[PDB]
Design a protein around this ligand. Structure first.
Ligand SMILES: Nc1ncnc2c1ncn2[C@@H]1O[C@H](COP(=O)(O)O)[C@@H](O)[C@H]1O
Ligand SMILES: Nc1ncnc2c1ncn2[C@@H]1O[C@H](COP(=O)(O)O)[C@@H](O)[C@H]1O
Ligand SMILES: [Mg+2]
Ligand SMILES: [Mg+2]
Ligand SMILES: [Mg+2]
Ligand SMILES: [Mg+2]
Lengths: 279, 279
């Protein structure tokens, strides 16, 4: 059980998939969970990026099916830009593909800026571009839980294998959610579900980006990772990759275990077994 | 096992404790985790309440010890009121007991209100007192994580058994954190640790409250729960309780399972096993 193999199991990566069937199980998952909770439906932030675009469509399929089955459900797609979003066009295009029951825009700037003006003031230092970026992510979570709490909806998270392995998300930010329909899928697999669902090619060929920085907006995930998604997917799918690559992915993975676990207490082992951990 | 024995085991509750030793193990836990993450210390929000008062003291004891061991550490106590806290005086008393390396006051009103005014404005509706309250708890998390990211500090969480069995905390609010030094302690026991540390009686005799609502500020937990901490502690420590009590406590436990687990995905079984979840 090599480390790479241990990661594949833990992240529920299926080395080979039938897109149609995957879409089936994932849409089935949203329905079964929402049914167990008695929630009125779902809420998800659509960024124009591949993952939310895909999670979004799976959500609309779920609620429509819940309706045809004789139930009451709804999906609200929510645009959460900071001021004018660089790729607003792309988000709109994703919205055109999703066909959400409802769609609404909530600029988070007033909230974020209120917080950072307050921080700099009272703490006599300004938030670095990075930390400020994490504020944006977290405020996006607050917004989705606000709408969800008011309308009785579950918050869909877009975490998948490609982001989980490198722990590429903000703790309690986009990482905080109730339901994860993309769990286990590699980046290229996610694209394969979009193709099967007939998504405009522009929607899955777009450059993955968290777009949080004020000075490097739209920054390529890969540019921050130092690892391309071809590699990550290769690794996750069980293929072989340059020892150079494997090792980097494996260290990023082990140092981010805290992001894939609930808060550590003295009764947990994962942090004890761990060589190190970086926050 | 009886459902009760399952909760006690799952929540790591010890029916009998030696206050002196519990303090040693818990301070030892803060030191180990932090030492394994290269973090520069901790950061915690001090409410004036019993939990943050205890966890706070354990954190100051940990950083002093780390420094004494030749290391480098710091503890920041952060007051996080909404406008003006009704019990600010109690927080001042707690701060005088904690004797934290540093302390700051960060009013979350401006940030929270910026959000509310934006919600009402864009969703032609207004946040209920309950949901706004959750926004505050969640903004409190944003603030701690901001300070933690700027100064390289870990975020201490004050969750414990008495609060976990009922899932009495905000998901991704105070529930969001990196380290849980009070895990497994009952409310009763937490006061014993405070007495052992020699806290002013007023610090552990105070009325437990999340104080999140505008219309009913300083609301007693017990009033919202319908279960006194005296009952919750009996249940958790293994003692006997009226059937209707145990029953109410066990239902709140199973329905809030989702708050004690990472976001659910189709590969998780806890939600499948559950008769019903409640968000
Ligand atoms: N500008 C945005 N508008 C709406 N949702 C967003 C935005 N940015 C991020 N999100 C949410 O955050 C998730 C993760 O983003 P990312 O860091 O690019 O992987 C997305 O899948 C969305 O649900
Ligand atoms: N007014 C406040 N100021 C600072 N920290 C707070 C405040 N309210 C809540 N917290 C944090 O949230 C935790 C949970 O509070 P509670 O809901 O009363 O159990 C506390 O133990 C603190 O760490
Ligand atoms: Mg993504
Ligand atoms: Mg993105
Ligand atoms: Mg508390
Ligand atoms: Mg309190």
């Amino acid at each position: 059980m090599t480390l790479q193999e241990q990661i594949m199991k833990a992240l529920h990566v299926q080395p080979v998939i039938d897109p149609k069937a995957e879409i089936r199980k994932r849409v089935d998952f949203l329905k079964d969970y929402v049914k167990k909770t008695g929630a009125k439906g779902f809420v998800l932030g659509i960024s124009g990026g591949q993952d939310s675009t895909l999670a979004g469509r799976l959500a609309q399929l779920a609620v429509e099916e819940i309706r045809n089955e004789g139930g009451n459900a709804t999906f609200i797609a929510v645009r959460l830009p900071y001021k004018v979003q660089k790729d607003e066009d792309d988000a709109q295009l994703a919205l055109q593909f999703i066909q959400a029951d409802q769609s609404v825009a909530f600029d988070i700037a007033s909230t974020v800026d209120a917080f950072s003006n307050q921080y700099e003031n009272l703490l006599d230092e300004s938030l670095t571009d990075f930390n400020k970026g994490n504020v944006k992510a977290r405020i996006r979570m607050v917004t989705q839980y606000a709408i969800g709490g008011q309308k009785g909806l579950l918050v869909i998270g877009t975490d998948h294998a490609a982001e989980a392995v490198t722990g590429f998300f903000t703790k309690f930010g986009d990482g905080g959610a109730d339901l994860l329909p993309l769990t286990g899928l590699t980046k290229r697999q996610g694209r394969a579900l979009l193709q099967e669902l007939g998504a405009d090619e522009r929607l899955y060929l777009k450059m993955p980006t968290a777009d949080l920085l004020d000075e490097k907006p739209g920054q390529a995930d890969e540019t921050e990772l130092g690892i391309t998604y071809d590699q990550l997917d290769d690794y996750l799918e069980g293929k072989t990759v340059p020892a150079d690559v494997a090792e980097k992915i494996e260290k990023r993975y082990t140092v981010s275990e805290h992001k894939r676990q609930v808060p550590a207490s003295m009764f947990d082992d994962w942090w004890k077994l761990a060589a190190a951990l970086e926050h």
